[PDB]
Amino acid sequence: AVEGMTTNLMMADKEGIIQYLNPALLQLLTHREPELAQAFPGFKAAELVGKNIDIFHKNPAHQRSIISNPERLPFTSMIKVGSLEFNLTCIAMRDTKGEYIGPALQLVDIT
Ligand code: HEM
């Protein structure tokens, strides 16, 4: 629904370790755990922080090349996550001195 359009955000460090999920995304992934557990059997949304993103990517070096090269960010794509569908945006996070920290992901639900 349009009432359900919100800001879904997930952050990782340069080594691909998930650092933070915002509440809207945590709520969505909890709601969608039926679909997510079919695509990713042991999936628990509250358990994602500290995990490496490589676990969830079928060709992990592809996403690694995207988040390792902040000069080529921002990156946008449409992705299928099990039976879910998202419009994905990946942007570079930087510290106060301008250094790249890792990727931030925004997902727009188009399931
Ligand atoms: C901040 C953490 C994450 C980053 C930086 C990240 C990075 C990316 C990027 C850039 C894409 C687009 C690839 C493309 O369209 O060519 C992508 C797609 C995808 N991501 Fe993630 N992702 C993250 C978290 C997750 C999580 C938690 C899951 C599983 C729940 C996941 C599973 C997928 C899947 C299934 C796709 C589409 C199919 C694939 O390329 O493997 N990602 N990810």
Ligand 1 proximity of 58 Cβ (cutoff 6 Å) = yes
At what resolution in Å was this solved? Answer: 1.7
Q: Give the technique used to solve this structure.
A: X-ray
The encoded tokens of residue 26 equal 């945590």
56 alpha carbon – ligand 1 mean position (Å): 7
- Is-contact 8 87, C-beta < 8 A? no
Domain boundaries, the chain: 1-111
Ligand 1 proximity of 25 Cβ (cutoff 6 Å) = no
> How big is the chain by its Cα radius of gyration, in Å?
14
E strand or H helix that includes residue 61: helix 60-68
E strand or H helix that includes residue 30: helix 23-31
59 alpha carbon – ligand 1 mean position (Å): 10
Ligand 1 proximity of 106 Cβ (cutoff 6 Å) = no
57 Cα distance to chain centroid: 11
d(CA 63, CA 57): 7
